[PDB]
Design a protein around this ligand. Sequence first.
Ligand SMILES: [Mg+2]
Ligand SMILES: [Mg+2]
Ligand SMILES: [Mg+2]
Ligand SMILES: [Mg+2]
Ligand SMILES: [Mg+2]
Ligand SMILES: [Mg+2]
Ligand SMILES: [Mg+2]
Ligand SMILES: [Mg+2]
Ligand SMILES: [Mg+2]
Ligand SMILES: [Mg+2]
Ligand SMILES: [Mg+2]
Ligand SMILES: [Mg+2]
Ligand SMILES: [Mg+2]
Ligand SMILES: [Mg+2]
Ligand SMILES: [Mg+2]
Ligand SMILES: [Mg+2]
Ligand SMILES: [Mg+2]
Ligand SMILES: [Mg+2]
Ligand SMILES: [Mg+2]
Lengths: 216, 218
Amino acid sequence: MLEQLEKKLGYTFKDKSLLEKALTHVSYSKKEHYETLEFLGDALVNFFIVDLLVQYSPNKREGFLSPLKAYLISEEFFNLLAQKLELHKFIRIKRGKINETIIGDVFEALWAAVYIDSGRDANFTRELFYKLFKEDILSAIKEGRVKKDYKTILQEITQKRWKERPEYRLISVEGPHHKKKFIVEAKIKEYRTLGEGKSKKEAEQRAAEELIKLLE
Amino acid sequence: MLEQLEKKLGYTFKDKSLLEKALTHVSYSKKEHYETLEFLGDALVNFFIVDLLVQYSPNKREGFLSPLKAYLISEEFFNLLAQKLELHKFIRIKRGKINETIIGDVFEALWAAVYIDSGRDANFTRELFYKLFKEDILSAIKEGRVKKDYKTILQEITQKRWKERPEYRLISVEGPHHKKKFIVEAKIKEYRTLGEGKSKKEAEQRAAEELIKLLEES
RNA sequence: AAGGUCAUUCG
RNA sequence: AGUGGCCUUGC
RNA sequence: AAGGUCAUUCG
RNA sequence: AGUGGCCUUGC
Ligand SMILES: [Mg+2]
Ligand SMILES: [Mg+2]
Ligand SMILES: [Mg+2]
Ligand SMILES: [Mg+2]
Ligand SMILES: [Mg+2]
Ligand SMILES: [Mg+2]
Ligand SMILES: [Mg+2]
Ligand SMILES: [Mg+2]
Ligand SMILES: [Mg+2]
Ligand SMILES: [Mg+2]
Ligand SMILES: [Mg+2]
Ligand SMILES: [Mg+2]
Ligand SMILES: [Mg+2]
Ligand SMILES: [Mg+2]
Ligand SMILES: [Mg+2]
Ligand SMILES: [Mg+2]
Ligand SMILES: [Mg+2]
Ligand SMILES: [Mg+2]
Ligand SMILES: [Mg+2]
């Protein structure tokens, strides 16, 4: 029920249809779904995060803050924030069709919905977002839970040492086409490592993470 | 002179150093420059533009609104909006060092500066931005004064017709290394065209535009 | 529609 | 962030 | 720093 | 949006 979500959010909607739209997947309704709210929500939440980063590190450069932002505005991090709202239990979509992509999109749409319902009060919405997640975000940073970009880190290591970039190649692919599992190999000089994932990029990130350790 | 910019903006700063920072390039000052404000400004202005798009097309999908956003938050469009502020005349950087990149960065930083100076009043800053640029943005959209993405349009034409994508290759490069001019060739099936630019991508965009015309005329 | 893949554009 | 071609699955 | 180039990550 | 290697130029 919507009331339970409003209680978790700490905000009561004037237009309940706005909240319903944010929670509804297009496959469930072609008239009122979250796609447009998600578009707005992405820009709104990205702004909330960037502002928080700059506020607590006013004298830090873009090279320090952007890597943090890159993870904090990611679908993965939004799924972690969404857990606090048990968002998955309010999404209107066929049973068993919910995945991280959907949860991440609804999270963004939900915030656009609050923003619009509040009369487009950006200040209000930003502070409500912080009331709920500011400490979680800052703590994730301080406690080292921000994920590293292993593919980039790896090529910086190899480019500094050998002025060369690592190479990745597919070793194997298995499972149904809509649920493939990839195994790739990362290599630099005579060092080689393996990585697995649901996409080639994910498998490469895993292999890079291992190759870095090996080089050390 | 800052007062002249404040007059154009319709906003008077409480902390003049914030405005100065937004107008100063790092090569001019390594202590107080616009780099961090630019980082914040990009996110702030992007939000202003996306909100405006959704507000005037609440029932339009992301596939319709994002292509518009892609142009409206681009450095190119920001340079056009900046002209209204004669922004180039207020930037603190060595004479003759100003270019489109700098102007676009200062534009974003300037808005982050207003946002911060106003006590982080996003609502107020959003409306100040609209007071100055809302009509300019909506008119650009309605009139079709939005840069077309020729490379993407071209591959959609070729993929629909032949389920194939065009190919690009470098034909020649000349001029100083810091001021190169590229000539590239775009091709699909037996159709080929040339394009030139200051970067390979720019040359490819021009070659793609010519190829789209060649296909339509065929 | 969801997963993957190739490609392209914008930030 | 958007889009197009291709494979798979879903209806 | 500014231009270009190759590559990589995030939206 | 960030970053790294390379070429050029600027101080
Ligand atoms: Mg309340
Ligand atoms: Mg969407
Ligand atoms: Mg997003
Ligand atoms: Mg999104
Ligand atoms: Mg998403
Ligand atoms: Mg790949
Ligand atoms: Mg910058
Ligand atoms: Mg920008
Ligand atoms: Mg910028
Ligand atoms: Mg810029
Ligand atoms: Mg080429
Ligand atoms: Mg290229
Ligand atoms: Mg897909
Ligand atoms: Mg890009
Ligand atoms: Mg997307
Ligand atoms: Mg450069
Ligand atoms: Mg990407
Ligand atoms: Mg940049
Ligand atoms: Mg030198």
